């Protein structure tokens, strides 16, 4: 399941976008629209293990977050993204899952959607492709998070 949860200034998901078709059944049962980030994200994790996409013994959930400037003030989003990161891992602790959080950029966000990937899948795709791990966009469409992360572990060659 590749999901994009678009939140507003009050951390609630205004709209949820499936970047991959397997996310659609998850979002259906989750219903994260009009839901605060904590419960919404918890639903995505909860519903995915119930549908058998992940098992609780090995579930690395990837979280990537970018602040697409609809709020900024002057120095808000710097510490604001930290409020995001702390919630992403807190929900991962809630669900009892393992996590990898790679913060995304707005530039990265539009690259992700152009590759037909979620920012999570893409953030680690772009990591792996730099590491010398040969990933195709089709491999990124298909291979699991645990497969992509596992390849970084045994073959790490770049920053």
């Amino acid at each position: 399941p590749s999901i994009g949860l678009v939140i507003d200034k009050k951390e609630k998901v205004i709209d949820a976008k499936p970047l991959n078709n397997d996310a659609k059944p998850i979002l259906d049962e989750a219903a994260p629209k009009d839901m605060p980030l904590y419960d919404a994200l918890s639903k995505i994790l909860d519903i995915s293990k119930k549908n058998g996409y992940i098992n609780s013994a090995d579930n690395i959930v990837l979280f990537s977050a970018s602040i697409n400037s609809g709020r900024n003030n002057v120095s808000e989003s710097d510490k604001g993204i930290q409020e995001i990161i702390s919630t992403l891992k807190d929900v991962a602790k809630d669900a009892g899952v393992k996590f990898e959080i790679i913060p995304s950029t707005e530039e990265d966000r539009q690259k992700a959607l152009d590759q037909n990937l979620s920012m999570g899948r893409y953030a680690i795709y772009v990591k792996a492709v730099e590491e010398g791990v040969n990933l195709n966009l089709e491999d990124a469409r298909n291979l699991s998070v645990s497969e992509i992360l596992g390849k970084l572990e045994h073959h790490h060659h770049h920053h």
Binding site: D8, Y53, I54, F63, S64, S66, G80, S118, V145
Partner: peptide, 10 residues
């Protein structure tokens, strides 16, 4: 709109 959280499972 503020942030996009893209979550990858499986």
């Amino acid at each position: 709109m503020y942030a996009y959280i893209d979550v990858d499972i499986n």
